Amino acid sequence: SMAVSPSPLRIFTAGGTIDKDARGLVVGDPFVAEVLKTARLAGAVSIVALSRKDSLDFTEADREAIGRAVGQAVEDHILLTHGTDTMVETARYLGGLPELAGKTVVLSGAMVPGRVGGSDAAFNIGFACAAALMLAPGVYIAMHGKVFDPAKTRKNRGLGRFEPI
Amino acid sequence: SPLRIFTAGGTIDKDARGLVVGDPFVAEVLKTARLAGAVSIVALSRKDSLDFTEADREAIGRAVGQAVEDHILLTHGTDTMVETARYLGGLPELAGKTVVLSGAMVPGRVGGSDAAFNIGFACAAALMLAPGVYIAMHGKVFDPAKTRKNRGLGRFEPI
Amino acid sequence: SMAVSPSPLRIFTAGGTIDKDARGLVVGDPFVAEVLKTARLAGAVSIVALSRKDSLDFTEADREAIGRAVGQAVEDHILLTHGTDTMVETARYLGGLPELAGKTVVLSGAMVPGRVGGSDAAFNIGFACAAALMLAPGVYIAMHGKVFDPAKTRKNRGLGRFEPID
Amino acid sequence: SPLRIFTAGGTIDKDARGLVVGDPFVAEVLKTARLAGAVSIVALSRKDSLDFTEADREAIGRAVGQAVEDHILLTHGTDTMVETARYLGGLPELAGKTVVLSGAMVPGRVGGSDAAFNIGFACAAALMLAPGVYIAMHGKVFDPAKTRKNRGLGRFEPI
């Protein structure tokens, strides 16, 4: 048969600074979809909205619903765009669900809204997409051009960066 | 792991300030990426890749061999990216390196460019893939020996 | 002599949505300076900072100070970038200063920060620069591709537009 | 006053597919300008202005004459903007209109372009200047009969 390009990555959007839209800022349409629109993909990426909340407003119940959506996807490569304030809490929660054992689940986002000049967003999305495809099964944070183990990571609010504990 | 980036020109770096090859766009993207790790950028060429000769490819291969880093990104034009990747794939000196070639179909300084996404994807690939030579474009990893540029499609494709 | 390009326009910056930047957004460096940097001007434009306040927070005293900077300029063509929330109050105040009688003074700004995609800012700066050069002496607001008389204008916060009192 | 905008191509409108002339950039700028007044945009040409003949200039003159509006902006390439402007300045049919020509030295779809600024400036000029034909570029108003394009300066300059 003629070659069929697969679509092995599914993306979930859960809000955050990456998606803030001043058109100060509040959470608008997912910025990840703008980046993939112009990525000239060989395949395609299904993109599904889970939430538009600021990550500091996430409850235990919000994390559980995200775990259930991730767990029910047919894809084994998952990228979750999210705010950076509670990305570590969501990542640690997902890491303790056995329903995710066979999946590579990467969380990412941006410190500068994608719709603001000089944003890290487009770089981070490309980096995180590749990380979701290439890393062994597990839950990871992809930021600053590297991979973080959620159990050994914290968000430094002052410096706007993830760092090792 | 420490990453070394080489720039050999191409559409990704075309500037209009038609277009012609300007300063490497990858340096603009990495500047706002807020990187944690060791990364350095080295300029090799501003040629349009259609003009690359066998001697240009051999010079690229020796330059990549000068890097002690084992994770390499080369930004390049798409017209002869496959020829450079296949040549590099046959150099025994590079056998322990992960070498990824990437670029852009639209200049990074033009609106709606794939460049920033491609640079992020390619940086991860150069850090995560096993030793070998790869093209990272269109959100996937190509094997150079089994890839061509399909000008009809506007994409790299498997042979 | 070899021709000398004049610099007949002076720009003052007083903050506003036009200048908001990520650090939500807050008032950063003047966006008007980024627009003029790439405008390939034949002349130049002297750009002076007066304030980084959100315009809601401007007092009687803030307006009086802006009136003094504008009045002491040598140039007779002046653009003031400003927040839109109290642009009408500033414009009305300047309109009552006899020291500005021979000057063309235009206020402008943006409803979307210049550093955000799909901003009105660069258009508004070009339109307002031309308005400051070409209108008769007076005080005006240049927004939405037109010229408003501050005495007959209000900001519609709800609608995001300047409009007449008709 | 109602403004009519004509697009005749030029660097301002060049897009990636080097660059070639694409959809009018003026329509992208006016879409986000939150305009209060009446403005309409009409496409005339996508030529590079070096290729315009005396017949092309005469066609542009009659198109401008078809507008009932008295305030006109024409976006154009800079290579023969002076030739078009001088030609229009000699048409008695246009004597009651304010006709402003503008464009950009960098395409509007390229980073660090003069285009958006030039469009705002030129729209104001078309609304505010006395009847006549003008070039609005570099934040000033040029008299076409006393203007040249100085490729050495990269600016229009007075004679």
Author numbering:
A (entry chain A): 0 to 22, 27 to 168
B (entry chain B), D (entry chain C): 6 to 22, 27 to 168
C (entry chain D): 0 to 22, 27 to 169
Copy text from the publication.
L‐Asparaginases (ASNases) catalyze the hydrolysis of L‐Asn to L‐Asp and ammonia. In contrast, the chain of ASNase from Rhodospirillum rubrum, reported here and referred to as RrA, consists of only 172 amino acid residues. RrA is homologous to the N‐terminal domain of typical bacterial class 1 ASNases and exhibits millimolar affinity for L‐Asn. Crystal structures of the wild‐type RrA, both with and without bound L‐Asp, as well as structures of several RrA mutants, reveal topologically unique tetramers.
Based on the previously published results for typical class 1 ASNases (Derst et al., 1994; Schalk et al., 2016), we tested two mutants, RrA(Y21A) and RrA(Y21F). RrA(Y21A) without added L‐Asp was disordered in the region of residues 22–26 and the active site contained a mostly disordered HEPES molecule contributed by the buffer. In some cases, orthorhombic crystals with a doubled c axis were obtained, belonging to space group P212121.
